[PDB]
Amino acid sequence: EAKPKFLSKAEREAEALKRRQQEVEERQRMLEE
Amino acid sequence: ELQYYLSLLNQQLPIESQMVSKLPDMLNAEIVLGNVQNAKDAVNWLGYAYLYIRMLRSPTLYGISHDDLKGDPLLDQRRLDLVHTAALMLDKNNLVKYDKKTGNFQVTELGRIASHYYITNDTVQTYNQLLKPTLSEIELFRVFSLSSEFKNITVREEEKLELQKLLERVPIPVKESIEEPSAKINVLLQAFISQLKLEGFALMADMVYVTQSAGRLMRAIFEIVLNRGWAQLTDKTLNLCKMIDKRMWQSMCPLRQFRKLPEEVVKKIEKKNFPFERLYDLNHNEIGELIRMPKMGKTIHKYVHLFPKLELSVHLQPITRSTLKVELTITPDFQWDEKVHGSSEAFWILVEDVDSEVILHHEYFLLKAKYAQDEHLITFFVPVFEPLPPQYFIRVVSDRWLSCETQLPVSFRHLILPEKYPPPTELLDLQPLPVSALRNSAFESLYQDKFPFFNPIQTQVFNTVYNSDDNVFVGAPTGSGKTICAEFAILRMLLQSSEGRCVYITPMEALAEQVYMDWYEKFQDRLNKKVVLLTGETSTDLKLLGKGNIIISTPEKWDILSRRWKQRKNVQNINLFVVDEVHLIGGENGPVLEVICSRMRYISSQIERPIRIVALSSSLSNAKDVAHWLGCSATSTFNFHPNVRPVPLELHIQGFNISHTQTRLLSMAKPVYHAITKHSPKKPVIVFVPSRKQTRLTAIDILTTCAADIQRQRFLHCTEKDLIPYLEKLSDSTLKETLLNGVGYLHEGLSPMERRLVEQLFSSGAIQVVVASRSLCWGMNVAAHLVIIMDTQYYNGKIHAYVDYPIYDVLQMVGHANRPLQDDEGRCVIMCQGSKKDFFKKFLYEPLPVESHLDHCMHDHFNAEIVTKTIENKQDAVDYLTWTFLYRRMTQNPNYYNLQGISHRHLSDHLSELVEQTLSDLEQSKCISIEDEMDVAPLNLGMIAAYYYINYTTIELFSMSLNAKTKVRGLIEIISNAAEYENIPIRHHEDNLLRQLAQKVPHKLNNPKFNDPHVKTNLLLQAHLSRMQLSAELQSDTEEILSKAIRLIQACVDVLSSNGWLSPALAA
Amino acid sequence: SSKTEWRVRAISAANLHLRTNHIYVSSDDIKETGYTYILPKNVLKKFICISDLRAQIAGYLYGVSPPDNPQVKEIRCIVMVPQWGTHQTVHLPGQLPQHEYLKEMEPLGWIHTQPNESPQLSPQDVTTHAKIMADNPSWDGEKTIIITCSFTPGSCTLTAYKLTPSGYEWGRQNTDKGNNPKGYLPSHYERVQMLLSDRFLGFFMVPAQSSWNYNFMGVRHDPNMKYELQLANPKEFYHEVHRPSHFLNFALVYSADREDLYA
Amino acid sequence: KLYRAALETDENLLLCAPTGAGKTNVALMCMLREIGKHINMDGTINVDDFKIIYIAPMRSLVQEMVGSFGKRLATYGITVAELTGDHQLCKEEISATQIIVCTPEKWDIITRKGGERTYTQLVRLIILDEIHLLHDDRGPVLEALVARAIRNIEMTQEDVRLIGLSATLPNYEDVATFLRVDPAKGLFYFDNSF
């Protein structure tokens, strides 16, 4: 949003891991297509 | 021929001057060396040679009749005719621009390359008319063989069979026929490069002479291709020069250039198609087993480790939308040896586009043996156009070693370039506001005798400054009258409230002292207002803020008061916040001013009182981000253009192709005097010198250049009777002798009273030249017509490199020559290197954008926020960092702030990572406590660092280096090794004085380093404690050390009292 | 001969720079239904000056579609794999290049220089494209094109060509390398629209170990040899490193030795 | 006969002596007179305060003169070196040594490139040996070097002792006037009988 919500290092690492897993799933779906 | 042999063996053969053949070459060499500039100087240089004496003694041998000798006894007409013929030969060969009207000659790059390589005029003309950027390697040999050095070399009919045999063995094909001398010279060069055995002795001598000419010809061709910008032609010329120097083909082995390698092992390595990079990864046994030679495997491994191959790393940062800053870190990955590499290794680094045809940035790097095995960082400016390439290529090749080149692809695919800059606020063509436009008569009485009408930018800003109270961002160049707008805003704040509290923050201490001295005569003398200046003492600063209405301060002085704004009610009850020169908020004292502005913007939105913020700075391109970060409105943003100054500035750039800084400073003395004589003959001039000791040398060189010509003592517009009371007050006899001729000097080592006397002598018009140091650029209360800034660099001894001058000091030196009534315009001649000419030309007319560098110095701001109970959690720290200028600069330039996107999630993750790094740096230094990785608590060390304005690293060093049994000799070394002593100036010729003073100190230093600033601070503290004698440059550093040594001793005493130590506290 | 023809080829390639100043595109018989080619001018100029008038030079073009425009394909990267082609065919290696730069763009096909301009597509090129498509599943039968950049007098005539599924099947089934092999039909190839541009610059990839040029040494070239590509500018066909045999062949002092001259 | 003009007098001398008449002795006396200004009684000699340039036309003759200067001035610590290599190597050899034996073409190239501008104030002894090639192909290069030296002595007022050695040739008065040598004390014209 407008106000930047501060997160921890572990929460940011978990968000980056979830984004990488979503990108890997999108790449696997694109490869299957 | 028996008579002439009888003439030389019996003293009967007079020596006849044959200087008419190389007279245009000598004229071009004298024009490139700076000895001759016009036709009169060329005639005077020709008259001092032996050719004029031979023409005067024997005119019949020189082709002069008796009537020409009778009509010209001094041989001036024949010398003028020879100078005109040499000028016509130089202009026809495009070597030097020679005008027939005035007779002045300007040396071009082709003439300088011909003089530096001893090339002829016809060869230079053939190289200028023959070399194309789309030329291949086959045409390059034909262009090099068609020079004027081989004009007398003929193709003999007896050597036609040898040329036909060598035509089938040369690796470079020749397009010309066998009867042409150019193809014969190309075949001879191919035979000398490939070490082909010849048969004819005269053909071998012609090939040796052709190679001895072609070495300098290829060097001049490589210089001309580097000056022209053709990247592929320069690469081919460098390959041809390396093949001519190493006497080997480009496809040969890299060990052939080393004379210690056997020929049979080199032939066995060349027989196997293996790259040279694969041999570096192998060991001494694997390289011996791969080439089937285990005895020579260790020698091959030593030759691979001794071959020049360095690792290059690229760091790109887009500063503007058209140019970026590229930092190249070069790490030597080879064993440096004096028998292989020597004292230094020269390399050429060329950064070009994806097409590899236009060299965008060409430079040289001389890695010395003393600076070997260390990564050197070279900063360059790379331009970028609207068709942005996916990647640029930075090729660093070896200038002496063949087949030693490292290529770095700098990718621009994921480069987050900033957006387009908004147009600046143009000055409307309105009527100038008179002195009667103001309401208060006391405010108009302080500016009636100064000027009857204000500036047009001041007339446009008076409607938003005097008739309003909002935050106004005034981006005006140095000399446009920002002080008049600041005085109008102060008068509006005084008319709105008579008991107001105005605070004017300026980064430079000398500029703040000048502003305080101006306000003492303008606001305190004519309006009777309490105008005070803040000091470095926190006890008197509160009384000066409570009793003063106009407080001039520094960001380093106001950061101690803004850190306790919740407790101090006088800082919360402010009426006006003026911030002068905010454009220097991205350099020295840069994040401190931004942190003070963010603290003022946070306290203005939390104390129920909107303070009038007036941010006066230079013309910035990204002024919208600075207006949004300071709360300025869109109508109050008076960001003018750099070309909208009242005094028109004519900016000239003198690029000198000199790698050494001392050689460039020695060579740029006479062009500086030539530019001073050509631009402003009867006007005062200010010469910006690189160093303090170089200012007296530049003044002596200017005095010698003035006394060499007929205009002796032309810089002294006054008489000696008016300067005799002025020269009697100076201490240096050399400075008084230079000021007697009209050339004053000013440096950091000079006295302040002597500097004030020199400024009063230069402002009155007695002297015409003022050689001021680079540190006295901002601290100069004078305005001249010409500003010659010579060699804008500094030889830093802490890194031992010639670091370039910052843009803020260059802008201050450009704006220092702002004469509104004394001169109609202002000349600014920046004489620097050729690589820094494009950046200085781009940062002069275009507005310089502001870039927040608060990420490198966020630890002290985080400690000050946590100690004042402001940033108590992670969200509070994120909200405090979001209100600063770094959050506004990250949204405009993500790649400059090391971000990967302008999205909210990526910026939030970057802010969380920065907050976590700051919390880890605070917890590792025992300055803060992290409760559940979310809450921040100030510790004792962090509160002691924020109270005495100390860094976290210095507080951690004082906490980990002071024990319960410490002494004074250990406490002095602990205070000298603090973070505040790392900013000590380290220049050339300073290690010998430190080594001489280290033997007289009362306390010895365990393994002292001549390049470390902590050892210099310890030596200065030992000299100040023992009251020993020192130089002026040492005393100028000792005073800056002792200015913070009291706060360092107070922090050490607080750390000793907090740890429960009585005897180390008493020793401190 | 490879004795005097090498010099003629080098001289002709020296003047091949001017041939890039005049580029013509055979915009005719375009289906106007498939994706368009947006090959940039810089990449074409680079690939035209690194080709020989006798030996055909081929390179794999990979790119991506412009945003919000799926009806066009922009070839943004060209990689020159080490190959040694003749005047009528190209012996491209069987290893499909892979790199970090190419990990974001799909293969757009191959571009082969043609020393002569022919009205009909070469059956050998069609067969090679079909074999490459069958071997490498990455290349599609409806997204890969064969840019037959022909050579013209004073000009570099360019033309795009796409293989029909029937043509791909015929090329995969056929294995003879004759001049007019059986199964080649005019319906096998279909020209596609190709437009040059000067708005987006192209990327060039060259092998990290060896050079892209391999016509000067057919023994070193291997049809199954693996290749490692990296972002670099390819060298010319008649380069010093392209022909090691012509360079390192000569075998290894009483003349006039002038020392300390003016240099 | 010219001992007081090369050791006791620092003026520009013109020695017109034939080949084999001890032409190196006058250059050694001029080098000893140039080193006599830097006494250094605490040490041996101050070699970082003066420089002696030796203009030799042949490279082997320049190497022989550098070897003779290294063998003769070994007790004084005068570093005799040959200016060769690149521009940076020649600048390092000029900044690291005192006696520099080089060609007139190499000295002209170093003056035009700027490698001797930083060490121009320390060079106070210019020994131009074998000036009898002033009509040869090395003529205009040595003439331009002498003109640059005369312009530096007239403009920058740098007193440089110029010792020009030539063979027994006529019209030596013009060569003495071109080298700023005095006709009485600086001019030494020896015939073939010497």
Curated annotation (Swiss-Prot), chain A:
Q: How is it modified after translation?
A: In vitro phosphorylated by CLK1 and U1 snRNP-associated protein kinase. Phosphorylated by SRPK2 and this phosphorylation is required for its association with the tri-snRNP (U4/U6-U5 tri-small nuclear ribonucleoproteins) and subsequent spliceosomal B complex formation. May be phosphorylated by SRPK2 on Ser residues in the SR domain; the phosphorylation is required for the removal of inappropriate R-loops during transcription.
Where does the record say this protein resides?
Answer: Nucleus; Chromosome
| Family, similarity comment | Belongs to the DEAD box helicase family. DDX23/PRP28 subfamily.
Tell me the function of this protein. Answer: Involved in pre-mRNA splicing and its phosphorylated form (by SRPK2) is required for spliceosomal B complex formation. Independently of its spliceosome formation function, required for the suppression of incorrect R-loops formed during transcription; R-loops are composed of a DNA:RNA hybrid and the associated non-template single-stranded DNA.
User: What is known about its subunit structure?
Assistant: The phosphorylated form (by SRPK2) is a component of the U4/U6-U5 tri-snRNP complex composed of the U4, U6 and U5 snRNAs and at least PRPF3, PRPF4, PRPF6, PRPF8, PRPF31, SNRNP200, TXNL4A, WDR57, SNRNP40, DDX23, CD2BP2, PPIH, SNU13, EFTUD2, SART1 and USP39. Identified in the spliceosome C complex. Interacts with ERBB4. Interacts with ERCC6.
Q: What is this protein called?
A: Probable ATP-dependent RNA helicase DDX23
State the organism of origin. Answer: Homo sapiens
Query: Highest lineage ranks of the organism?
Result: Eukaryota, Metazoa, Chordata, Craniata, Vertebrata
| Gene, per the UniProt record | DDX23
The shown range, given as first to last of full length, is 158 to 190 of 820
UniProtKB/Swiss-Prot annotation, chain B:
Q: What is its EC number?
A: 3.6.4.13
Q: Specify the effect of H674A.
A: Strongly decreases ATP-dependent RNA helicase activity
GO MF annotation terms: ATP binding; ATP hydrolysis activity; helicase activity; identical protein binding; RNA binding; RNA helicase activity
Tissue-wise, where is it found? Widely expressed.
One GO biological process term: osteoblast differentiation
Subunit and partners: Component of a core complex containing at least PRPF8, SNRNP200, EFTUD2 and SNRNP40. Component of the U5 snRNP and U4/U6-U5 tri-snRNP complexes, building blocks of the spliceosome. Component of the U4/U6-U5 tri-snRNP complex composed of the U4, U6 and U5 snRNAs and at least PRPF3, PRPF4, PRPF6, PRPF8, PRPF31, SNRNP200, TXNL4A, SNRNP40, DDX23, CD2BP2, PPIH, SNU13, EFTUD2, SART1 and USP39. Component of precatalytic, catalytic and postcatalytic spliceosomal complexes. Component of the minor spliceosome, which splices U12-type introns.
The similarity comment for this entry is: Belongs to the helicase family. SKI2 subfamily.
Name of the protein described by the UniProt record: U5 small nuclear ribonucleoprotein 200 kDa helicase
* Organism encoding this protein: Homo sapiens (Human)
Query: Which gene specifies this protein's sequence?
Result: SNRNP200
From Swiss-Prot, chain C:
Tissue distribution: Widely expressed.
Positions of transmembrane segments: none
Specify the MPN domain's residue ranges: 36-167
Q: Which residues form a coiled coil?
A: none
Substitution effect: R243G:
In RP13; reduces interaction with SNRNP200 and EFTUD2
Known disease link: Retinitis pigmentosa 13: A retinal dystrophy belonging to the group of pigmentary retinopathies. Retinitis pigmentosa is characterized by retinal pigment deposits visible on fundus examination and primary loss of rod photoreceptor cells followed by secondary loss of cone photoreceptors. Patients typically have night vision blindness and loss of midperipheral visual field. As their condition progresses, they lose their far peripheral visual field and eventually central vision as well.
Free-text function comment from the UniProt entry: Plays a role in pre-mRNA splicing as core component of precatalytic, catalytic and postcatalytic spliceosomal complexes, both of the predominant U2-type spliceosome and the minor U12-type spliceosome. Functions as a scaffold that mediates the ordered assembly of spliceosomal proteins and snRNAs. Required for the assembly of the U4/U6-U5 tri-snRNP complex, a building block of the spliceosome. Functions as a scaffold that positions spliceosomal U2, U5 and U6 snRNAs at splice sites on pre-mRNA substrates, so that splicing can occur. Interacts with both the 5' and the 3' splice site.
Q: What gene is this protein a product of?
A: PRPF8
| Record note on what altering H242R does | In RP13; no effect on interaction with SNRNP200 and EFTUD2
Location within or outside the cell: Nucleus; Nucleus speckle
Q: Which portions of the sequence form the region Required for interaction with EFTUD2 and SNRNP200? A: 234-263
**What is the official name of this protein in its record?**
Pre-mRNA-processing-splicing factor 8
